[PDB]
Design a protein around this ligand. Structure first.
Ligand SMILES: Nc1nc2c(ncn2[C@@H]2O[C@H](COP(=O)(O)O)[C@@H](O)[C@H]2O)c(=O)[nH]1
Ligand SMILES: Nc1nc2c(ncn2[C@@H]2O[C@H](COP(=O)(O)O)[C@@H](O)[C@H]2O)c(=O)[nH]1
Lengths: 394, 394
């Protein structure tokens, strides 16, 4: 009864999951949170908060690995999937990890210094602890390499693209990929004759146009800072204004990189929370700055959704996913309210239902376009890729 | 037989026109080009290139004023209109120039140091040379103050908006205003029940959503650097990428402000020209970089047009204007080609015709939305405002 191990090595954390090959069901989940710090803890299911003080990426994985042998799971780890943040232009699909892969990942790491270099430390540690186990590298950017130049190029001088590698890459590729695959079934569509818009909304957020199967436009840019206004992230911002602010407050480019990435967004406007559950309540309690933060949020999502639709020959569906998209009744309706121009009519009884109802249509009959919610499973997709790559003979 | 004098004091030039009150027709046009330099010339109609060596904003206007008395026009200058670049949040409409106005213009000048401070020098000089003549200040930003916060706020911290005044303002307001007014007549619409998209495309470029008469969304931001990719201007650009480039080439914020504003855009990609007539030919001659520069241009216009439509309850028309929009057959069709999602069908015989045909529908019957071209007249609108403000008793 074989399983697949899934690893995501963030900036300050290691998120892991164990899935069954037969069912693709989670049999264990956990997190090694607060990495590299004076005190680092491991938490499986949120039941054991085992401390490890000053421990790094390798030492954590060793602790996690023990907690699998402790539960007699070591001998069943058939495959190991690794979430990779930035694949650049070198990775179009999912691959079996080899020296060539590690080497190519090292090459593109310049594009995302924080995330990528942690992923490599997660690969190397897994390479170590699991020898005969075939490993797979899954890229958050690969789904997007189907974009045309006219859609990925920036309005900057060519030198930057050809020499320095400056271009739009877009993120949440695995989420946008999975969600769209599922969307073909639920909406009874033809992948080769389809036009979808996928709104991944949560911690970080992006839109993606999926034409006839492939990604043809996405909101996030070279970094995850472009597109929609997000939790702590500003979203689209006038560079002439950023350069102006630099001249006023005397702040540096590095200073503003922090403000834009960590102090801006939903938090930035509200001066309250980078979280909807709070802000949604704050509005109802009469807070205006929070009401604006959400109206502004909603507005920028509708602008991009409708804008991304221009990359499709015909619009068939609009899909919500991520923490916010799946769970938030209000933002869903507010975003449709805004996109009445496309002849969208929402079925409020269908939109009322929580995330327990899973995959669900939320639009009515008169509506020109079908709306739906599909819970993303970044983990399931990583597994499926590896299970497929398991049949491969290297 | 009264006339109106129109003045536009750019960074390095003074563009002027003389219009008849009865007909709103141009009776004289000219330019004082290459200002403040070692040699500064004046050119009426392009017939006399009178040099003035080292001459400033006041001395040029004196020379222009003589060339009106020389043609017996001084005694007929009933009104003087002044193009003002940046009105901030203080000016919602056109006004008669008074001390209070000059004072308020001084207050908002921080938002556009280059343009605004030249406009004031144009007002002061005209104040001088014409005493009893009533003067009018017309703002390139005023039409846009009808925007909701959710549409003008940036994803930055609130402090910047409330204290520092950071927000979207949008430009080409007079062009977007005039064009839309005309569009109601040509398309037989009801201003109070209308939804237009106006694409001003030329030197600099912007889109504007006009719902039930008023501006509800525009592409340009606080500065004229946001929105579409333009001639020398980059357009929308990932700030995470600009901060990344800063870390690579070691360039400063001021360095990049120049690259983005002057070295980027159509010129930036092509490495050839900041002008379409050339690039349109280059493509046909087999140049790829120019072909991309235009495909990229087209694409970013369609993204914003469709995106701005989300600010309308219903889409009735799409309007092209400016040097590029009025004159370019190809870009018009390429932009419609891209916006097939909205059910746009273009009548190519109608699109073939040059700018001599003036105001003209270019879409067919099957098309869900009417397309049209309307030649902007920033000057005529400035006059009309002043002629209206001429009836006012101060
Ligand atoms: N309205 C609402 N928002 C939620 C709920 N659960 C999570 N969220 C939002 O989803 C975000 C987390 O996104 P995630 O990391 O899961 O993609 C949080 O900012 C939070 O506000 C819920 O039950 N209701
Ligand atoms: N294709 C084409 N483009 C033109 C023509 N005249 C002007 N343009 C374009 O319009 C731009 C000038 O915009 P303007 O300053 O008039 O708003 C130039 O970049 C130029 O390429 C024309 O006859 N054909």
């Amino acid at each position: 009864f074989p399983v697949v191990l899934v690893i995501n090595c963030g900036s300050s954390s290691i998120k892991f999951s164990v899935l069954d090959v037969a069912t693709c069901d989670v049999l264990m989940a956990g997190i090694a949170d607060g990495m590299n710090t004076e005190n680092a803890f491991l938490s499986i299911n949120g039941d054991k908060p085992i401390n490890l003080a000053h421990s790094n990426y390798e030492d954590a994985l060793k602790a996690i690995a023990f907690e699998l042998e402790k539960r007699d799971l070591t001998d069943s780890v058939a495959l190991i999937g690794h979430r990779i943040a930035h694949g650049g232009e070198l990775f179009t699909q999912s691959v079996i990890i080899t020296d060539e892969i590690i080497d190519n990942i090292r090459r593109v790491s310049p594009l995302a210094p924080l995330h990528n270099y942690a992923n490599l430390s997660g690969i190397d540690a897994a390479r170590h602890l699991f020898p005969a186990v075939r490993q797979v590298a899954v890229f958050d950017t690969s789904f997007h390499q189907t974009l045309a130049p006219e859609a990925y190029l920036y309005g900057l001088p060519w030198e930057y693209f050809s020499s320095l590698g400056v271009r739009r890459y877009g993120f949440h590729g695995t989420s946008h990929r999975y969600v769209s695959r599922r969307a073909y079934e639920l909406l009874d569509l033809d992948e080769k004759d389809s036009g979808l818009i996928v709104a991944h909304l949560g911690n970080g957020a992006s839109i993606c146009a999926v034409r006839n199967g492939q990604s043809v436009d996405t909101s996030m840019g070279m970094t995850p800072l472009e597109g929609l206004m997000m939790g702590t992230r500003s979203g689209d911002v006038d560079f002439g204004a950023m350069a102006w602010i630099a001249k006023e407050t005397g702040q540096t480019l590095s200073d503003l990189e922090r403000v834009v990435n960590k102090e801006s967004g939903l938090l930035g406007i509200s001066g309250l929370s980078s979280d909807l559950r709070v802000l949604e309540k704050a509005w109802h309690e009469g807070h205006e700055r929070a009401r604006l933060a959400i109206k502004t949020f909603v507005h920028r999502i509708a602008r991009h959704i409708a804008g991304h639709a221009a990359s499709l020959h015909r619009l068939d569906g609009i899909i919500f996913t991520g923490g916010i998209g799946e769970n938030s009744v209000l933002i869903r309706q507010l975003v449709i309210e805004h996109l009445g121009v496309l002849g969208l009519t929402l079925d409020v009884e269908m939109n009322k239902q929580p995330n327990s109802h899973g995959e669900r249509i939320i639009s009515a009959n008169p509506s020109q376009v079908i709306c739906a919610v599909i819970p993303t499973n970044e983990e399931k997709m990583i597994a499926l890729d590896a299970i497929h790559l398991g049949n491969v003979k290297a």
